Design a protein around this ligand. Structure first.
Ligand SMILES: O=c1ccn([C@@H]2O[C@H](COP(=O)(O)OP(=O)(O)O)[C@@H](O)[C@H]2O)c(=O)[nH]1
Ligand SMILES: O=C(CCc1ccc(O)cc1)c1c(O)cc(O)cc1O
Length: 447
C-alpha cells in the first residue's frame, strides 16, 4: 500500500512549533508518514520539551536534525533562513517517496526553490490570522508607493474581516525603511504565487470575510488557495499540579487568565501595573509572568520581579495565583473556572480561546497582535483598548487595567458571542466543516 509522506519545517518559537505539531497530529490521524525537521539548537526549553513529548507520543515520525552556525527568536529566524540552504540533502533523499512539503511562513524565500525542486506540492503554514496574511499579501502594493512609509494612515484591503487597519495597528518595524521585517515582507509576499496553497489556523466562525476575500482574489489577484485548517485542537502530548487543583476550588467563570505569550516579557514597571490592576479588580486571576523573552534566561525570582509592595498585596488575598513557569495554557482555558482571558492576542492563544469559548481582553504588544485584536473585536467576543498602544510606548496604569478587567468579566454580551464562536469551531472540524473539507482535498492530491 502506498503512502502520503508529508515533510514539515517549523521555525523558532512556541507560537510556530505548537501549531505545526498540532498540524502533524492531524496528518498522522489521517495516516500520513510525517517527516519533521528541527533546526538545532532550539531557542527555548519549551520547544525542547514539547518536541521530546511529541516524538515520545508519535515515535513513527521521521525526525531529522541539522545544526546552525536584536531578539533571540528573530535571530534564529535568520540562522534558519540565511545559513541552511543546505536543507536540500535532508528533503531530497527522503524515503518513502515524498508527497508534499509544508514549511513555516517565515522561510518562504529560501525554501521555495528547494520545494520546487522536490517535485511535490508545497505549501506554507501561516501561524497568524488570515487577516494578517492578507496584510502580508497586500503589503508589496502599499509599500510600492512613494507615500510609503511616512504617508499611510490607513491600510484598506477589500473584503477582509478588518476593512480599515489604522497606522496604529501596523507592526512598528514595517514602518521603518531597511527593517529586517520589511526586508522579509518584500522578499516573500511576491513569491506567494509560486506556492501550491496557504494553510491558516483559522475557520469561518471568526474570519469569514478574510477567507472569502483572499480566495475571491479581492486582496491580490492570483494568490494561491487559502485553506482554513483551523481551529487547531490542542493535543495530549502538549501537557507536561498546584494550578490544576487551585482552579478546582474557584467558581465557574470567575478566574481571569492572563498570559502574553511565550516570547514576550513586559517592562518591569509596566508588569507591576498589571498585578496592581489585578488586585484592584476584585476578581480571581491566574497570571503567567515572563521576565525574559527566552524562558532559559529567567534570572531573578518572582519576589524581586514583582516587588515587595505588590507581593504584600497578592498574598493578602489568596484570590489569585501568580506563576513564572511554563503552563498548559490549553488546560487552563478549558477549565470551567476560567471566564476571562487577558491576552497579548497571539494567534495561537486567540484560536485556543476561540476553541474554548473564553472571551478575551486584548492587550496587544508587538507585531501582528493589534490586527488579531480587532479581528476578535469584530467578532463580538472580545474587547481591546486602542489607546494603550504598543509595549514600551506607554505605561498603562493599574486603574485602567482594573476597569478594563471588570468591564469584560461582567459583560455577558461577549460570553453570548464567545460560545457562538465555540459552536462554530466545533462545526469546523466535524463532517462538512471548513477544515475537514480542506484536508480531504489536499490528501487526494498528494496521491
Ligand atoms: O505559559 C504558556 C505560554 C504559552 N503557551 C502556548 O504557547 C502559544 C503562544 O503563541 P502565540 O502565537 O499565542 O504568542 P507568541 O508566543 O508567538 O507571542 C500558545 O499555543 C499558548 O497556548 C502555553 O501553553 N503556556
Ligand atoms: O507581523 C508579524 C507577522 C510575522 C511574520 C514574519 C515574517 C513573515 O515573512 C511573515 C510574517 C509579526 C511581527 O512583525 C513581529 C512579531 O513579534 C510577531 C509577528 O507575528
Amino acid at each position: 500500500h502506498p503512502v502520503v509522506h508529508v515533510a514539515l519545517l517549523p521555525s523558532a518559537g512556541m507560537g510556530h512549533l505548537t501549531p505545526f505539531l498540532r498540524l502533524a497530529s492531524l496528518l498522522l490521524h489521517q495516516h500520513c508518514h510525517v517527516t519533521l525537521i528541527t533546526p538545532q539548537p532550539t531557542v527555548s526549553k519549551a520547544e525542547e520539551d514539547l518536541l521530546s513529548r511529541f516524538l515520545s507520543a508519535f515515535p513513527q515520525v521521521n525526525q531529522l536534525h541539522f545544526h546552525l552556525p536584536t531578539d533571540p527568536f528573530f535571530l534564529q529566524f535568520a540562522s534558519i533562513r540565511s545559513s541552511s540552504h543546505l536543507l536540500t540533502p535532508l528533503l531530497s533523499s527522503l524515503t518513502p517517496p515524498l508527497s508534499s512539503f509544508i514549511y513555516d511562513m517565515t522561510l518562504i524565500s529560501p525554501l521555495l526553490p528547494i520545494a520546487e525542486s522536490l517535485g511535490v506540492p508545497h505549501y506554507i503554514l501561516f501561524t497568524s490570522s488570515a487577516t494578517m496574511f492578507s496584510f502580508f499579501s497586500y503589503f508589496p502594493t502599499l509599500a510600492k508607493s512613494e507615500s510609503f512609509p511616512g504617508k499611510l494612515d490607513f491600510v484598506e484591503i477589500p473584503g477582509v474581516s478588518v476593512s480599515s487597519i489604522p497606522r496604529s495597528s501596523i507592526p512598528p518595524p514595517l514602518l521603518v525603511p531597511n527593517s529586517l521585517f520589511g526586508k522579509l515582507f518584500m522578499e516573500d509576499s511576491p513569491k506567494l504565487k509560486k506556492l501550491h496553497g496557504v494553510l491558516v489556523n483559522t475557520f469561518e466562525g471568526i474570519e469569514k470575510l478574510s477567507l472569502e476575500a483572499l480566495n475571491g482574489g479581492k486582496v491580490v489577484k492570483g494568490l494561491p488557495p487559502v485553506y482554513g485548517v483551523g481551529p487547531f485542537v490542542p493535543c495530549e502530548f502538549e501537557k507536561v499540579e498546584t494550578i490544576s487543583e487551585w482552579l478546582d476550588e474557584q467558581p465557574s467563570g470567575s478566574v481571569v487568565y492572563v498570559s502574553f505569550g511565550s516570547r514576550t516579557a513586559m517592562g518591569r514597571e509596566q508588569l507591576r501595573e498589571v498585578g496592581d490592576g489585578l488586585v484592584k479588580s476584585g476578581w480571581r486571576f491566574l497570571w503567567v509572568v515572563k521576565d525574559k523573552i527566552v524562558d532559559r534566561a529567567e534570572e531573578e525570582g518572582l519576589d524581586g520581579v514583582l516587588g515587595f509592595e505588590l507581593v504584600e498585596r497578592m498574598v493578602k488575598e489568596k484570590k489569585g495565583l501568580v506563576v513564572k513557569e511554563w503552563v498548559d495554557q490549553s488546560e487552563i482555558l478549558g477549565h470551567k473556572a476560567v471566564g476571562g482571558f487577558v491576552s497579548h492576542c497571539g494567534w495561537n492563544s486567540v484560536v485556543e480561546a476561540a476553541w474554548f469559548g473564553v472571551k478575551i481582553l486584548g492587550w496587544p504588544l508587538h507585531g501582528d497582535q493589534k490586527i488579531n485584536a480587532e479581528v476578535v473585536a469584530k467578532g463580538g467576543w472580545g474587547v481591546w483598548k486602542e489607546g494603550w498602544d504598543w509595549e514600551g510606548e506607554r505605561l498603562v496604569k493599574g486603574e485602567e487595567i482594573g476597569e478594563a478587567i471588570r468591564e469584560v468579566m461582567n459583560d455577558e454580551s461577549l460570553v453570548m458571542k464567545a460560545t457562538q464562536v465555540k459552536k462554530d469551531a466545533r462545526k469546523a472540524i466535524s463532517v462538512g466543516g471548513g477544515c475537514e473539507v480542506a484536508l480531504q482535498k489536499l490528501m487526494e492530491v498528494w496521491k
